Design a binder for this molecule. Structure first.
Ligand SMILES: [Mg+2]
Ligand SMILES: [Mg+2]
Ligand SMILES: [Mg+2]
Ligand SMILES: [Mg+2]
Ligand SMILES: [Mg+2]
Ligand SMILES: [Mg+2]
Ligand SMILES: [Mg+2]
Ligand SMILES: [Mg+2]
Ligand SMILES: [Mg+2]
Lengths: 52, 63, 225, 240
RNA sequence: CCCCCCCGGCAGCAGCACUCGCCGAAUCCCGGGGCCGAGGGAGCGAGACCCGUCGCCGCGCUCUCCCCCCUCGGGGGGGCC
RNA sequence: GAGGCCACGCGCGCGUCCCCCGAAGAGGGGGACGGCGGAGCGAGCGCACGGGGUCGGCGGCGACGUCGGCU
RNA sequence: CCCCGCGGACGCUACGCCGCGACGAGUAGGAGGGCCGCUGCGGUGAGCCUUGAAGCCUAGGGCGCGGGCCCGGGUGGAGCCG
């Protein structure tokens, strides 16, 4: 089966590797952004509550 | 189940001579090879005529 | 002449390898171009609907030109007209699937077999899942699995279709050579719907499964193959 | 020749590298590394010796077979996988970390609680529920047949001897050389003997695991007891 | 409490406060359980000789040179226009 | 002008476009693209989601009592 | 110009062997195959057999989808089978 076997898909569709690589890179970038954005919100929440 | 009809599955045709003539069978062997290993459609027609019955191989007069 | 014949075979082998290399680069770049085309179509419908709503108007999309038809009833007690049309749709078995190009002639055929089929409008994903997992070619009257691109090119290369991506592009965007590319595909032999059906004996709009479910055919397809 | 380099294409998912074909082309500097153009003796000559025997003899190695069987078996096709067991990747469950208390499920040490030390080259776990506690020596075990509990001791900075390998623990056999038909009983040597080396290794590891066991209260009592299923308790509701 | 505001601002956003969707060229990663292992001479090459670790496909290193970080030659990285 | 991507990477000559001076907007000097032009060749190790399973993994037990025999 | 090696599996009853794909209900009825079975004749097996044929019996061992068949043990006493 393609869609389950990477090399079988690449034999039929060589462009599937760059789409898959771009997706994995993009999803890691988006995940990192949402993690850092959320931590900043918590850090601002802590700062606005323990500002003294 | 599949919606097909099985009454015409088997094609009725001569795959070999019904005769037991060993000289006819030897030159059927020769033309079975020549039909398979050449692109000549002449050898294909001659091979299938060798299979045919006597009534399907009528005599040819000299005239 | 041993040295010269070695050179001849090396040159012939190297020439064939370069031809394979060039054909692989073409296949790679066509899929890159198709990916650009697919996202342009997807964004355009969103963009057209947005400018209509901005002006207070209504954007009516193009009527779908591709259908996936699934036969859902068996082969027992079928009237002769329904039996004939199902054969013309290449649906001779239950849970068989076939892509159908939609027009007046084909739609009126779908109305006749309406209690016997479930159909709808496949999206890009459904076409990819069907061709990649269950795509078989009718090659020399034989059901051959689409495991190599050379099987498509030898049968459909005269139409410009030389890879899985070209076959998918022709099916999805109903092209000039849809009839040849669609008839090349052996009709899809799908499994039973995992999770069951609602009711195969009534229409979809009345709580059942028969008839035209517009784009819910994709939900059916995911469970079906 | 040149010194080997690292891959220069980091893996991000198995089978997919982080960089594309052109990106790896520039990383490798393939634009300047462009190349266009520029055994075993089967027979041996040996001096045969002796007068008028000729000079030497062209003695060939690997003489042709003396006998051929009446029929053979065709050779196999090729499989592009199916590595030998020694080349398999060894997988360990995340709940089994060095120092984890395990529960043995099979064997004569059934139900005993032991201490996990390290995974061996075959993937078998090396455990020692210390011999002074529950009579389990340094012994191999299979991760499929153990239960990893939650309680752990920090067995970091202890020194497991390096000779403690799979070959160290592999069973030894005597039978059967110089003996074909059994008319005198060969039941001797059936008494497995504990080597002095095994006792030395047992003492060496246990001398530095036992103080860490005594560090937390009544863990030694826990290790002395065995695991059992009471009629009220069910393994699917138990947190281990 | 509801509606209209002269207008809102901030965060989040079909919500990791489980109110209500349709999806994936706008989709990828990982894990677990079950059943199965059919086939058996794939070598254009050396003129094979240990049982063809072979084809297609996807990659890594070397035939260039500098560095960097751990081990004590080995391992892991940055590249080099 | 203090990042990302590319299945972009030899020369020579020819073409197409862009830039400079342009002393006839001549004539040369530079970039980009090319599917154009008469002339042979990369090899050497590996890893594998790659034309259907293997282990270059292992254990226990065996004569008057037990082992196998779906018939 | 092969040769430090003088060497290199199996196959192809061609009425044989090998590959790929689809398919498999069945009365009346039709057809094909039968190394299914019975009896006798021409050939053939330098076939079997009083050191035991045919037949029969058998909680014995098997083969074939099947028709059926082979082998062991007993009984039997002169013929039998491919
Ligand atoms: Mg059927
Ligand atoms: Mg029928
Ligand atoms: Mg019915
Ligand atoms: Mg279920
Ligand atoms: Mg009805
Ligand atoms: Mg969301
Ligand atoms: Mg097999
Ligand atoms: Mg039938
Ligand atoms: Mg009948």
């Amino acid at each position: 089966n393609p869609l389950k076997n990477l090399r079988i898909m690449l034999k039929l569709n060589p462009y599937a590797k760059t789409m898959r690589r771009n997706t994995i890179l993009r999803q890691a970038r988006n995940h990192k952004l949402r993690v850092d954005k959320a931590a900043a919100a918590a850090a601002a929440l802590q700062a606005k509550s323990d500002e003294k | 189940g599949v919606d097909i009809r099985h009454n015409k599955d088997r094609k009725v045709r001569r795959k070999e001579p019904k005769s037991q003539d060993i000289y006819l069978r030897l030159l059927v062997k020769l033309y079975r090879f020549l039909a398979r290993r050449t692109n000549s459609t002449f050898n294909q027609v001659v091979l299938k005529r060798l299979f045919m019955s006597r009534t399907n191989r009528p005599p040819l007069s000299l005239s | 002449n041993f040295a010269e014949l070695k050179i001849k075979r090396l040159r012939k082998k190297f020439a064939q390898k370069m031809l394979r290399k060039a054909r692989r680069k073409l296949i790679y770049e066509k899929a890159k171009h198709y990916h650009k085309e697919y996202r342009q179509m997807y964004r355009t419908e969103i963009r057209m609907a947005r400018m209509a709503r901005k002006a207070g108007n209504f954007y009516v999309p193009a009527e779908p030109k591709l259908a996936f038809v699934i036969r859902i009833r068996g082969i027992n007690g079928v009237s002769p007209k329904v039996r004939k049309v199902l054969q013309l749709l290449r649906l001779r078995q239950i849970f068989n699937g076939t892509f159908v190009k939609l027009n007046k002639a084909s739609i009126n055929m779908l109305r006749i077999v309406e209690p016997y089929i479930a159909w709808g409008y496949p999206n890009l994903k459904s076409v990819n899942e069907l061709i990649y997992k269950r795509g078989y070619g009718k090659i020399n009257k034989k059901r051959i699995a689409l495991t190599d691109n050379a099987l498509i090119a030898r049968s459909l290369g005269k139409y410009g279709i030389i890879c899985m991506e070209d076959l998918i592009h022709e099916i999805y965007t109903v092209g000039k050579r849809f009839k040849e590319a669609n008839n090349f595909l052996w009709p899809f032999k799908l499994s039973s719907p995992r999770g069951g059906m609602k009711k195969k004996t009534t229409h979809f709009v009345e709580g059942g499964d028969a008839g035209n479910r517009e784009d819910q055919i994709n939900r059916l397809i995911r469970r079906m193959n | 020749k040149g010194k080997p380099h690292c891959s220069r294409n980091p893996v991000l998912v198995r089978g997919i590298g982080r960089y594309s074909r052109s990106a790896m082309y520039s990383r490798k500097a393939m634009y300047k590394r462009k190349y266009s153009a520029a055994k075993v003796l089967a027979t041996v000559t040996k001096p045969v010796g002796g007068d008028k025997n000729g000079g030497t003899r062209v003695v060939k190695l690997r003489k042709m077979p003396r006998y051929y069987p009446t029929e053979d078996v065709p050779r196999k096709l090729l499989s592009h996988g199916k590595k030998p067991f020694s080349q398999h990747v060894r997988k360990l469950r995340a709940s089994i970390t060095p120092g984890t208390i395990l529960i043995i499920l099979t064997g004569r040490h059934r139900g005993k609680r032991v201490v996990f030390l390290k995974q061996l080259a075959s993937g078998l776990l090396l455990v020692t529920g210390p011999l002074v506690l529950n009579r389990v020596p340094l012994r191999r075990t299979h991760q499929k047949f153990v239960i990893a509990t939650s309680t752990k001791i920090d067995i970091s900075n202890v020194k497991i001897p390096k000779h403690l390998t799979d070959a160290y623990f592999k069973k030894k056999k005597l039978r059967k050389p110089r003996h074909q038909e059994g008319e005198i009983f060969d039941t001797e040597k059936e008494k497995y003997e504990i080597t002095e080396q095994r006792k030395i290794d047992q003492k060496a590891v246990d001398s530095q695991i036992l103080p860490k066991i005594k560090a937390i209260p009544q863990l030694q009592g826990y290790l002395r007891s065995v695991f059992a299923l009471t009629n009220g308790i069910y393994p699917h509701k138990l947190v281990f």
